[PDB]
Amino acid sequence: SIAQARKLVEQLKMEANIDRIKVSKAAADLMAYCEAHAKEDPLLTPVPASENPFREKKFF
Amino acid sequence: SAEDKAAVERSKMIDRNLREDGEKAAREVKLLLLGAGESGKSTIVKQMKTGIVETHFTFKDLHFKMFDVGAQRSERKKWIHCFEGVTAIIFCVALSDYDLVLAEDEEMNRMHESMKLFDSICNNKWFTDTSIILFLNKKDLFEEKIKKSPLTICYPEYAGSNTYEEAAAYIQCQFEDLNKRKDTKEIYTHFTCATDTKNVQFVFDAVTDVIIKNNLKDCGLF
Amino acid sequence: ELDQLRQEAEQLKNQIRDARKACADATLSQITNNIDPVGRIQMRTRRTLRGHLAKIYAMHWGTDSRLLVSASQDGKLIIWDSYTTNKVHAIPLRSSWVMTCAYAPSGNYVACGGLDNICSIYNLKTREGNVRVSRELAGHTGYLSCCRFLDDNQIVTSSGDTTCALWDIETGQQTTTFTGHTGDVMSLSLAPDTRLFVSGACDASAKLWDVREGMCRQTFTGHESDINAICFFPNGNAFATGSDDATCRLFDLRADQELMTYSHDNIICGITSVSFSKSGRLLLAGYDDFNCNVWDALKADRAGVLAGHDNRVSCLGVTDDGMAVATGSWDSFLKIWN
Amino acid sequence: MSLLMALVVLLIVAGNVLVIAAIGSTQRLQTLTNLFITSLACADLVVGLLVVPFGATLVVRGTWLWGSFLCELWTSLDVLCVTASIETLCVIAIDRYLAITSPFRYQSLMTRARAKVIICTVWAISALVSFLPIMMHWWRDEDPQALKCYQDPGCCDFVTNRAYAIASSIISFYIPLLIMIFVYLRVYREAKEQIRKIFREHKALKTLGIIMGVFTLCWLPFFLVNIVNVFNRDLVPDWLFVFFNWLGYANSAFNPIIYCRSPDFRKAFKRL
């Protein structure tokens, strides 16, 4: 049983020592990434039916 | 084009095969076998003939597929719903497990663990209509055990003398008084042992009654 | 000793908690104040796939964004072409109890598994015929819950025995094992670069694993019950988790905390699946109420709902091109939405 | 009586169209017995669409206003649909009997192919005993009382001879009635025997009583007079013939509420 507890303690120690950035920077990064690829999302902004593979398009 | 017709014909053949396979499987009688490791399901399986085990056997031109999931040993709450629709649930309980205890916990009789499992599955939201066959195995050994030992071990409350028939009836009653869908499902009990040679016939009769009742309730006469 | 180790561990846990707290400069909702809303997302059903005679349990899209797979309890694994809806392949399974599927990035192999505790890999271009069982990976002691290819050789799977495994298909041997979950691992998601992967378990926690060293780098908590689904953000710097608590949660890797919670008072069922959009702005989540809700990933608002199934939505996925969304259900039908 | 036909035809068509829509849209309803239910519903639908309106015009006006050809066509179609419905009501009972008395032989032998075969056979016998003998002027009578009716198109009565009046009565109602009685009595006995294992004896009896009594009350009064008229055309009045015929028609309205009382039908209707 001591081995399990030692493993858990060492794992917690390894997980505690990591460089974390403030939540503001991560929020800004997510916002910026979502904004950069906004025009490339078919689901977000509907695309004209002429280029929709499921409404009216040419297959082969 | 030619490729389009080829693909459509492939799809049509696949649909034909799927329909055939489905209609063939619909005639199967699917049973779910359950019980502790020391219940005696090994003997029941041997008489009727890693992961999940499947036994196929025929009787009176009737095909039975029995699924045994005893070797899972994980949280049952995640996969039990995969068996919603089986014709019936066979549940084995060793009658000689009343004066014994589990080797893991402190003083928890195996009879009480079997009772807990029965109460859990019988009253499960996924098996409201499914019926349960209840095998009460190891009757020959139970007779001798109770002839020498008393029954006040696991059942501190017991009104009656120590005799095989009385104790067997009391245990059957205690196990049948655990289901709350007394009007939606029916329990079929049977005292069996290593030398019975009639358990397959009991299962056949139980499945016959289950199918007849299902048809009658679908018609509207039950 | 016992209490010695437990007390130093609780001290380390308090240290980690305080560290996470100190790094909380502002909420995602406070930075997303002026972002324009998304607007009512009306998505209609375009194609419907019939042919399964039982409840579908999993599906996965192909990297080409046209072919897809679906496994059902009838013992069938069907590969469909969504553009025409004509079944391309139908594979019978040695075990009717299947719970996951997977499509190789190259499209040369498919994988499945379930209560048989085996990952079956089938080849689709064998040499002369249609389909043949290529490999059977049997090293788990619990049901196989999820699996995802890394290449034509490596494959990572999760099982109910509270462990994940990385197998070398050519050899059929666990090249690596991931342990640390105290509950059944119910799902996993590979990162875009295939260097890491997150896994959610029934212990109400998620873990980030490295595929090379094979250690746990970060643990994420916050849920109250089992996690049933998990997905990576398009840039691999975050992920989303759905649980039985009727709530989704967005976790960040660099910050190591919870960013946003997507829930609603009118939602009590459990979340069955989750997925993102090509831009990551939308978060689609298939629930147990027979519906599928589309949430805003930056404002935490419900914008749209896909309601076309009779039974619960068991699986849900989006295409690489991001042109449609496939959803399966226990009612034996798959639907493509656009 | 001009407005009494409106709601009748509306009910007849609405029930059957709803039944067809429910059996078509939802997937759970695609069973084997539902095939016979669809046959019965389509027959009752054809009834409500074509048979009842022309009879309504006949009874409200006083004379046929569509010519001898359409008169004979409508008579043949009425006989066809009535026989088809009353014989599907018998194959349904035979199916229930086979399912409740031998579930394994039933699950094995019974299949969609044989179901289609039996449905087409019922429809073939219906057409055989309805269309050929009528449009071939084989149902005519030798008596003169009905001569002017055959000649003048203004009359479209159902006067017929003895041979055909017995043949149609026995092929459409009297054999199916005995078959239904026998099979449903056996089913009642089996249900009793099954309840003996454990209100239900009253529930089964109530269901079977409704099923049999609605059908009997609807049709038997007409098919008694039908064979009584041949012996003596004057014993029974003429208006009671038409009244009993329309009572029998009402069986088409009453069938769906009886043979589609399952919870699945109610769910498909609510979702409809």
Ligand SMILES: CC(C)NC[C@H](O)c1ccc(O)c(O)c1
């Ligand atoms: C008045 C006519 C058109 N009605 C005929 C009646 O519905 C009928 C049905 C079946 C028969 O076998 C029959 O002799 C008579």
